[PDB]
């Protein structure tokens, strides 16, 4: 299924995912596409930060859901 990730620069990333994908898997896909290290990524769905070892279905992410991506400063 298709999900979208909003970024602070106003661009929307489109990802192809499975409900069984881990959050870490989703961060790996963002790294593959955007060059962003997973350790710099914090993902949010509907007011909940996404924990790396959970799956997309743990958060009831749906087809065409939108996530929010925030990058860490420094680190």
């Amino acid at each position: 299924m298709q999900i979208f990730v909003k970024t602070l620069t106003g661009k929307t990333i489109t990802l192809e995912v499975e409900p069984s994908d881990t959050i870490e898997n989703v961060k790996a896909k963002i790294q593959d596409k955007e060059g962003i290290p997973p350790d710099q990524q914090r993902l949010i769905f509907a007011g909940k930060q996404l924990e790396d070892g959970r799956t997309l279905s743990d958060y009831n992410i749906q087809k065409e859901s939108t996530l929010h991506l925030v990058l860490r400063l420094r680190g």
């Binding site: 790294q31 593959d32 596409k33 060059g35």
Partner: protein, 259 residues
């Protein structure tokens, strides 16, 4: 892989990516053709912005023509092509493989009238698709013929050739999946643990690679130098894979690279 990814299924349903890969294969050597990747009827703003961008590039001479597989519904794509006619006018040719007039897609029409009311619209309105799964093959074949200035398949020709055009397209899709998988494996070995790599680091990693022979490094690097390694761009896994997939090297050694 999911069962709905099996190319041997005569009823395989094309994805947006399949269509894009086929148009790039059959039309993409000509840099002056815009191949539009993701545009849908249920995205009025994005659709108006993409059409504005395409018409601007054709008017401003940066592009000669454009092919647009427009997604209108469940597994349904319509073929829209845009080009410069012989009378200093923009010519919009269109065919729905179901034979529905362009007037049924009012959001598209009102978008074209709003953006270019002085464009000519050739709605070829030709029934071709005879089942729910053949929209993919025909949008691809239509866009190629329209951008070549050749007549699209008639209703009767479409019935005879439906299986042939699908066969040769999925033959490419199968070869292309292999090339992309090889390119992605090679990208992994070159990227190591990095989030991005510069073209300069890419060159040094190919030099230092302990798997490829001297002759393989030489072919790969000559391929890259032909179109890349000019400004030390920073690459991701995705853009490196695309770069490698386009090399003669990976196309000629994809199987060796995977086994």
């Amino acid at each position: 892989m999911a069962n709905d990814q099996d190319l041997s299924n005569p009823e395989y349903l094309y994805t947006e990516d399949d269509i894009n890969q086929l148009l790039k294969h059959y039309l993409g050597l000509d840099d002056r053709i815009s191949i539009i990747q993701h545009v849908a009827l249920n995205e009025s703003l994005l659709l108006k912005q993409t059409l504005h961008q395409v018409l601007s590039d054709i008017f401003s001479g940066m592009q000669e023509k454009a092919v647009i597989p427009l997604h209108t519904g469940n597994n349904h794509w319509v073929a829209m092509a845009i080009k410069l006619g012989m009378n200093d006018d923009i010519v919009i040719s269109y065919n729905d493989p179901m034979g529905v007039s362009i007037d049924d897609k009012v959001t598209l029409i009102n978008c074209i009238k709003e953006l270019c009311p002085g464009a000519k619209i050739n709605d070829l309105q030709t029934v071709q698709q005879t089942n729910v799964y053949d929209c993919g093959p025909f949008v691809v074949d239509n866009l190629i013929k329209m951008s070549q200035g050749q007549p699209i398949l008639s209703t009767e020709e479409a019935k005879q050739q439906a299986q042939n055009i699908r066969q040769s397209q999925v033959n490419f899709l199968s070869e292309n999946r292999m090339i992309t998988s090889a390119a992605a494996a090679l990208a992994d070995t070159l990227l190591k643990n990095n989030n991005r790599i510069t073209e300069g680091v890419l060159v040094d990693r190919i030099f230092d690679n302990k798997i490829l022979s001297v002759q393989e490094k030489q072919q790969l690097l000559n391929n890259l130098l032909d179109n890349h390694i000019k400004e030390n761009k920073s690459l991701t896994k995705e853009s490196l894979t695309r770069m490698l997939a386009s090399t003669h090297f990976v196309q000629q050694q994809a199987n060796v690279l995977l086994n």
